[PDB]
Ligand binder design. Structure first.
Ligand SMILES: COC(=O)[C@H](Cc1ccc(O)cc1)NC(=O)c1cc(C(=O)O)c2cc(-c3cccc(Cl)c3)ccc2n1
Length: 278
């Protein structure tokens, strides 16, 4: 760690503290995560090889004393701050579309490598001046945000799949479009019920096996489903159709990242550059 000079703290929570730092030798500016303390070290060192333009690079893993440091490629801004900055006008559709497309590319890559993110949220999606967007904080190692949690996770499924990331991304897509969180729950049951209130209480018809999930209770209220026209106005039918497929209750029916990339919504995708104030 002596090889790094901390510039300023930029994060704190899930694991440890995050600092913007300079590599005293390479001259590089990086994001340095210091986690307070065998399989882990091995697995993590592995994922280090995983390289894709839409995944934040893990540059170094440094273990010393009862401390573990992860060194990442540095990006100045995240999507949550950009969404907040764009709140008055909203992010232009062509940029929402580019970001969604890129995130699906990153996920398709992770997923083809049997890697699940598990906790996608705007705070952990980093953007740059070139119009790129990247997946960060995979939880490789505060109030927990539940807004983007897939229903199978909330219902106690222990062996959930890559479909959980597609659900999270659908929630983020909707939020970019409407400028409002889709399902802002403040507890696990409130998150669950907010989902049910919008998409309808799931049953065996639309989600075979749902009534047998660990945390499923027959006593859940039975709400009827709303229509997406009310959910994400004024997103076009191509966008709504794709969102509906990313928000299917049944994980096995939920669209994959690879198939989503082929959806008609992306026929006219481009790569616009955002206006960022760093
Ligand atoms: C907004 O704040 C953040 O996003 C913070 C700080 C930050 C802030 C700015 C930055 O530029 C970087 C980090 N991010 C993190 O703490 C953080 C944590 C992990 C992790 O799982 O431990 C992680 C893993 C990969 C990775 C890489 C390759 C393969 C795989 Cl499976 C995973 C890539 C980025 C990651 N970032």
């Amino acid at each position: 760690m002596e090889n790094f000079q901390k510039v300023e703290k930029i994060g704190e929570g899930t694991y440890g503290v995050v600092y913007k730092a300079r590599n005293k030798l390479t001259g590089e500016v990086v994001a340095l995560k210091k986690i307070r303390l065998s399989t882990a070290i091995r697995e993590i060192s592995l994922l280090k090889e995983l390289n894709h333009p839409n995944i934040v690079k893990l540059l170094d893993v440094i273990h010393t004393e009862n401390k573990l440091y992860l060194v990442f490629e540095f990006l100045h801004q995240d999507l949550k701050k950009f969404m907040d900055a764009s709140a008055l006008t909203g992010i232009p559709l062509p940029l929402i579309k580019s970001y969604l497309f890129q995130l699906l590319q990153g996920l398709a890559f992770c997923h083809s490598h049997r890697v699940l993110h598990r906790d996608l949220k705007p705070q952990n999606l980093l953007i740059n001046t070139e119009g790129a967007i990247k997946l960060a904080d995979f939880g490789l190692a505060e109030v927990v945000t539940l807004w983007y949690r897939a229903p199978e996770i909330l219902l106690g499924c222990k062996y959930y799949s890559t479909a959980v990331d597609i659900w999270s991304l659908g929630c983020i897509f909707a939020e970019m479009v409407t400028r409002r969180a889709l399902f802002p729950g403040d507890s696990e049951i409130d998150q669950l019920f907010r989902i049910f209130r919008t998409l309808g209480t799931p049953d065996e018809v639309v989600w075979p096996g749902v009534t047998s999930m660990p945390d499923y209770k027959p006593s859940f209220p039975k709400w009827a489903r709303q229509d997406f026209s009310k959910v994400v106005p004024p997103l076009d039918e191509d966008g709504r159709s794709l969102l509906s497929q990313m928000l299917h209750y049944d994980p096995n029916k939920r669209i994959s990242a690879k198939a989503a990339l082929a959806h008609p919504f992306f026929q006219d995708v481009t790569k616009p550059v955002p206006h960022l104030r760093l």
